[PDB]
Structure formats: C-alpha cells, structure tokens
Design a protein around this ligand. Structure first.
Ligand SMILES: Cc1ncc(COP(=O)(O)O)c(CN[C@@H]2CONC2=O)c1O
Ligand SMILES: Cc1ncc(COP(=O)(O)O)c(CN[C@@H]2CONC2=O)c1O
Lengths: 479, 479
C-alpha cells in the first residue's frame, strides 16, 4: 500500500506544533503573493510576530561572541600579526584558550557525546557563580539547543500511553508536541490569569490526583520559568513549594529556564531550581532534577547556532548510563553551539575593555526589550475586549480577547478554533503573524494569542496601528 | 515511583549503540588513569580506532570552507580592507553572496525548518550537476548531520512493533538503534563477505517474505552505499535491480550516501540512487525515496559541525506536510552546518587561486586515505586467524577473526560476546580501541571487529606492532 497519511505513525498525526503551523504556512503563501503581485495586498511586509527569533528582527549579534567564533573557525588567522588590529585582544586570548582544550585542536571532530570536557567545566563554574553552590562537569550535557534535551527526557521516562507529565496550561508547545511524539499522556495544570499567571501547588495537587484516578502514572512536572507564553517569573517562596511538592510526590522536576536572563520587573529576580534544591539541602533524592538553559534567548540571541545544555542531579548510575546511551546516538552536539554555551556562561569579567563594549550591548538590548515589553502591553490593553497581563520576563505578550458569539460561530462554520480564526483574519488584513491561544492550551472558554516583543522599537507604533484598524473592524462585524 | 532502570522506557533499554558502547566507556575510564597515575598502564597513549572522526586524528580542515565560515560567522569583517591580505578573494565573494540569501542578513536566526532557501538552492544545483537530472529546493531538508534525518523517517514509518525495515548486516548501529528507539522491527539481510560484501536482491526477497510470514509489515529498505563497516561500492547494474525490486515490492528506499566522496577503487565510480531512479524515468510516486548526505565524511569532514540533509522524492503532499511537522519542532539545523553543506556540493570550480590549493588539498587526503586502506588490509591478513577484504570505500576495515574455542568459553565465563572479549583484552594491553562485530551484527558463527582507516600515516606501523604482539599472545594462550 502507498505511504499515505492514513498509514503513518499515529504519534506523528496527533502531534501538533502551532508556532510553525497553520498560520505560518498561510503566511508563506502570502509572502509569495507580494513577490509575485506587488500591491494586491493591503500591506507591504509580512511581520513574523510568531517566533522568539530576536535577530530575525533588529537585534545585533554581540561582537565578542562572534569574534571568538570566527577565530575558532579559522584558527590559522592566529598566526598573523594583522588580526591584532581587527580583533579584540581578549577575544584572541579566549579563542586560544578554547582551542587548547579541544584534544588535537580539532574544532571539526566529534566531541565526547556530553560535550567537550573543558566547555563543560566552564559551564559548571558559571552555574556555581550564580547559585553559591558547586556544579559538576559530569552532570552537564551539551545539546543542539535546549530542544533535544526535552525529547531525550520524554523518551527516557514515557513507557506508555498511560505515562504522564504535568504541564502548565498555557505552555510553549514543544512539550505538548514532544509528549504526543513519544506517545505519553499530557496532564494539565492551570496558571491563574487573574493572579498574574500564578502557579498554585494545590491546583497541581488536585490535577495530579485527577490524573491518577483516571489511571495515569505521572512521572514528572515541567516548570517553565520565566514562563512562555506567559512571562511570569516564579518567586523564591513559591519555588520551595514546588520542590517540596515533587519530593513527596516522587516526581522528576523538569526545569525549563531558557528565559533566565530576560527579567524586566524591577521587583523580582531569577532563581535556579538548582539554587533552590541545594539550599533546601538535598544531595540525592534530589528528586530527579533536570535544568535546561539555551543560547537562543536573553541578550545573545543566537537561535541559529543551536547551542545549550541541561544539568542532571538525583539520578543513579545506571540511569545515568542510559541517558548517556540516548545522547551518544547522534554523537554530539555542534561544536560552535558548545563554545557559545561556554561563553554565555562565562562572559567578559570587567577584566577587559572588550567587557566594556559587551556591557553596553547587553544593557540597552535588555532595556530595549522591556521598554518594548511595556509598550505592547499598553497598546493591547486599550483595545475593545482585549486585556493584556504584565510581562515579567521572556519575550512575549499573551493577550486575552473576549471574542463575541457571532465570531465564535463564523469560526465553527469555517471549521476553525475561534483563536485561529482571529489569527488568520488578522494576517489577511495586516501581514502580522501571531500564534493563536489554541495548542498553547488555555482554560476552556478563554481566548488568546502570542505576540513577540521583538519588532524594532521604531516599527512598533506603525504595527499597532495596522492592528487596531483590523481589530476594530473585526469587532464591528462581530459584536 | 523512584526512577530506575526497572521502570524506564523499554525502547531505550533494548537499544544498543556500540560505536560508543561498553568498550568506549572502559577506554574513557582508562584515559583518566594515565593522567592520575602515569606509569600504571602497559601502554602510554589511548588510540580511538573506533569512530570515523578524521580530524580527531591528524587531518587538516579544508581552508576555503573555513575562510567562508569565519566571514559568515563574523560579517562586519567584510567591511575592512585588511582581509584581502588574510582571506582569498575567492572566499570573500562567496561569504558575501551567501550572506545575501539569508533573510535579514541574520546569521544567528532560526531558518525556515528545511534550512535557508538559498542554501537548498545551491544544494539542488550540486545534485543536478552530480547526476544530470534536475532537483528541487523543496525536496531538501537540512539537518544537523545525516543522523536526525534517519530518526525522522523511523518516527514517520513505524507505528508498531510489527512495522519493519530491511537493514543490511553488518550495519552502522544508528539503524539498529533507531529502530529499537522507535519500537519497530529490524529485518536483517546479510551481505556476503566472500563475494565482496555482495548484495543479491534474490536473497533480500527471501528475507522479505520470511518477515511478511512472521506477520511483520516491511515498510522500507536501507541501503548504505558505500557501506559501513564493510566499505563496498555498489555496481550500477546491481543498483538498478534494487530500485525495481523496491518499486515492485512497495518499499520506501532509504539511501545512506554519506560516503559518496570516499571511493578508492578506479574500477567503479559512485552513482546516486537519485540518478539510478531518474534513469529509469520516474518523477512522483515513481517510488518513495529518501537519500542522505553528510558533511562529516569525505575529504572534508568536519563531523563536529553537524551538517547534512536529505532529499525526498516520490512522496505525496500531505505526507510531506507531516515530515515538515516533525522537523519544525526542533526548529532548524544549525546555520553553519547549513552553510557548510552548500560549500561541499558547490566547491570551487576551476576558477580561483583557491581552486588549486583546494584540490591539491583535495587530493592529498583521499590519497592518504586510500594509501591507508591498502596498508591496514595487508597488515590484518598477514596475521594468522585474520582475513580482511578490500575496502573499496569509506573509512574502515572489517576483519574476520577466527577465534579458538577456548576463547569462546572464556567470553561466556566473562559474559561477553566473543569478539567483545577480544576487543577489551586488546584495549587493556595496547590501548587500541576498536568496535566488535556483534555491535554491527554479523552472520551467526562468524566474528569481526571494525578498525578505522584514520590514524595518521606515521602511527600505523607502531600501532600494528603492538596489535600483532598482543594478537599472537592471545592466540597461543587460547590454543
Ligand atoms: C520555554 C522554551 N523551552 C525551550 C525552547 C527551545 O529553544 P532552543 O531549542 O532554540 O534552545 C524554547 C524556544 N522558544 C520557542 C522557539 O521559537 N520561539 C519560541 O517561542 C522555549 O521558549
Ligand atoms: C553510514 C552512516 N550514516 C550516517 C551517519 C551519521 O553521520 P552524521 O555524522 O552526518 O550524523 C554516519 C556517521 N558515522 C559514524 C561516526 O563514527 N563512526 C561511524 O561510523 C555513518 O557512518
């Protein structure tokens, strides 16, 4: 029989990934329409407001980072006196220190499947000057981004359709996609929109009991902190609760901390789950704890590079061997992403002026983002039926829309979720690509969308004008 | 509710990847020993002859490729004039026109999930040049090396414990591992050692019905050409029989051509299954075909970079909609991987100063390799109890060991496969790491081990003197 949709793996069919799905494919059809037919569209550019891809938009690559990477890439450059004029001194000094920790100066070879050892040591030292607690090179696994590390873990832990993971609703849908792909149950817990997207451990507990009664064995809890799509930053005190909760529930803690250097609210600061766990005084029975961090986000932003890592603690060898086994299949992650992870974790120290150029780009880039983060909040809040929460961190705003019934029905007719119907019509009127609430998951009855915070600071008012024009015409058909 | 090997995914436990298996693990352990206590070992270096990792050993990276990547890595460099002095005009042109197929000129941005469009265009042209049949940008998926593309077709086609895949024996363990990880059935078909590792489609037809009779539904056929570990190169005539056999039988054809540029026999050249398929005239549905190419291999690699791609043809959209979904998720392959992949298919072609440095450079390494393949084969044959076939292509030799029966017994008592007992014993005396046949799979009753062809030219004689003093000591102990 011919290979067809009817005879593919069910886990691939139930899998859905909205960030790069229906709306984006529609957007690319429209992209062609204005190479081919300039002027047939009511707008000029397509604005991808759908993906946290800072450099896609204006963001400038940090220079110290690119300098070292250009150097490690072509190491012969180091045997030439000119480079001294074009490259910073400590970038040349860092390149050389790095090449000296790869075994035969081979930047092109496969590394140990956990990552070059040096780079792992560097990262372990960055973790420890962030926590106040030591870290081990042996516990780190360098990955092609944070993504493969979530797959690795779903695959380790899900034996059955009956296996379950607690996931926030709404969630960055790599979790809901990864979990369908590995054929396991998704067990929602519900972030309180009214309480600033608050995570309450009694809600988790209740949801964990409902899933157990239903017969599902729940293996782990994912926490996204800072959150995506909701940008909440969890607080120290709430974090002790989650850790104590996993301990007596026999649950792996999956800590997604990719947005850690994206904290915009003056009031709160980032705290590692490792910092919390160590401090509570756990050394093993550590609950298993896996922490993810990536090079894609923050100020570096750096997604194409495909670099990141995760740290494990509180697993036995021979469970650790089994992890090593899954990772060793692809051999290793890409070296340039590995070097990059090390750099993000040891940036310049003030010891050198390149440090001064660095501090300027890092700041400014982060001021830009939160200046940007607030403007979109205020803009959206002024709109009929739209309410936009504070964004403590990350790079996303996630407004609620109070879609009228005439609009819910027109969506039922079009065979679309009300969210997606809105997101699609927006796109047709304005070229603005956003991701609909659905398959981020949301409280049934409520409706949202996720915009990026990353359009160019100067392009923003023009963007919220195109938008409001559409929204208010949409409201006038459908209220 | 503790986490333990008793309760992990049985798909993970069954899976086995020897290329970095138990032997690699003992070796790593022993490497640390040489640092901890310098005179304890009976040897003083640890030689990984277990993994096709050219640059790990002596091999120099290709200069043009590295020039173009650094510029792409650090683009402001294009701006200053010093570079004309350091970089060749050749590269500068190229880094520049590459930087212009990238959407925002943005090099740390996620791409489209297939990879940068322009790059797919370059690769499509390289393929046309190679076969003289046309090929589209659309049918290409840039991946972090060849490997994730193999996981991707397994994930797509395996529904079930009864779904199955025809795989050559011996086979590079990514295949047996990836079939175990997606919980399907490996259907072995044996290559025939004495006929140059010949593959007869009459014998594959036998394996196929036997499988269909055990109630397994065989969805695909993997051909590795050139082979690994067995290094053979297929004849055109044989390949044609395979294509027709596939069409007639209903199989997907998964062609792993990662070693296209590793051919050391003037007798036969390399013919891609794209060509073999077009040459029988067939565009869509002619048959489903997936073919892999990678950056890591050949004269160039380069394994650390993790670049590669697959070319699908003969699948319907919406099945292509589904491939796309799986890949979207991880978002993209690293950008320097993608760039490199275009450089490898469109290298310099007779016009720049760069060309000659480049072919001198290109030629030196193939030749070194070929020189190396002839040495090792001759070395292992001379050895009593060991036979060794020509290696027509790729990076390795696959010698049969004729183990005495007292040696089988010793291995049972140590609870290892016999060739593993050998591989370990060998490691513990000489420091040489090699992968044992059970490990790639082999005809029952026979025994083998894979050595790489890749240690620098000078080190071989010394390496095979230790090997031989060990070997013949082992053979008279077990007399
Ligand atoms: C919470 C979270 N975890 C993990 C990842 C994976 O990142 P990398 O694999 O690139 O390291 C992302 C990426 N952010 C998604 C991807 O694109 N835009 C987003 O919202 C994320 O937001
Ligand atoms: C036949 C074959 N296919 C696919 C791959 C995957 O290549 P990427 O590096 O592009 O993912 C390899 C790598 N070969 C391994 C590397 O070490 N030993 C080997 O034989 C291989 O030999």
């Amino acid at each position: 029989a011919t290979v067809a949709v009817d005879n593919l793996n069910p886990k691939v069919l139930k899998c859905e990934y909205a960030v790069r799905g229906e709306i984006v494919i529609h957007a690319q059809r429209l992209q062609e329409q204005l190479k081919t037919q300039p002027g047939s569209l009511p707008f000029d550019e397509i604005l991808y407001c759908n993906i946290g891809n800072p450099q896609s938009l204006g963001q400038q690559p940090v220079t110290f980072f690119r300098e070292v990477l250009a150097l490690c890439d072509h190491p012969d450059l180091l045997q030439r006196e000119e480079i001294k004029t074009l490259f910073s001194a400590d970038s040349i000094s860092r390149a050389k220190q790095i090449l000296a920790m790869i075994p035969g100066r081979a930047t092109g070879a496969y590394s140990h499947s956990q990552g070059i050892h040096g780079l792992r040591d560097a990262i372990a030292s960055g973790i420890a000057s962030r926590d106040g607690f030591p870290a081990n090179a042996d516990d780190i696994f360098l990955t092609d981004g944070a993504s493969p590390g979530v797959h690795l873990m779903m695959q380790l832990l899900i034996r059955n359709e009956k296996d379950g993971i607690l996931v926030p609703i709404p969630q960055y849908p790599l979790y809901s996609a990864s979990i369908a792909l590995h054929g396991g149950a998704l067990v929602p817990y519900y972030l309180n929109e009214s309480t600033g997207w608050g995570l309450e451990t009694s809600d988790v507990k209740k949801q964990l009991e409902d899933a157990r009664s239903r017969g599902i064995n729940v293996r782990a809890l994912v926490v996204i902190n800072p959150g995506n799509p909701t940008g909440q930053v969890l607080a120290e005190e709430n974090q002790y609760d989650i850790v104590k909760f996993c301990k007596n529930e026999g649950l792996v803690l999956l800590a997604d901390e990719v947005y850690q250097e994206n904290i915009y609210v003056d009031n709160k600061k980032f705290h590692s789950f490792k910092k919390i766990v160590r401090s509570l005084g756990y050394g093993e029975e550590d609950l298993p704890l896996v922490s993810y961090q990536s090079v894609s986000k923050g100020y570096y932003g750096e997604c194409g590079k495909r670099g990141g890592y995760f740290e494990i603690t509180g697993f036995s060898a021979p469970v650790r061997e089994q992890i090593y086994k899954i990772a060793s299949v692809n051999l290793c992650s890409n070296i340039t992403g590995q070097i990059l992870a090390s750099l993000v974790m040891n940036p310049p120290k003030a010891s050198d002026e390149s440090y001064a150029s660095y501090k300027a780009e890092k700041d400014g880039i982060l001021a830009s983002l939160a200046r940007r983060a607030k403007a979109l909040e205020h803009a959206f809040n002024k709109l009929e039926g739209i309410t936009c929460n504070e964004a403590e961190g990350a790079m996303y705003v996630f407004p609620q829309i109070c879609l009228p019934q005439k609009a819910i029905e027109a969506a039922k007719a079009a065979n679309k979720a009300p969210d997606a119907f809105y997101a699609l019509r927006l796109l047709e009127s304005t070229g603005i690509v956003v991701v609909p609430g659905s398959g981020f998951g949301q409280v049934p009855g409520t409706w949202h969308f996720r915009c990026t915070i990353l359009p160019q600071e100067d392009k923003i008012p023009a963007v919220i004008s195109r938008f409001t024009v559409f929204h208010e015409a949409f409201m006038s058909e459908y209220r």
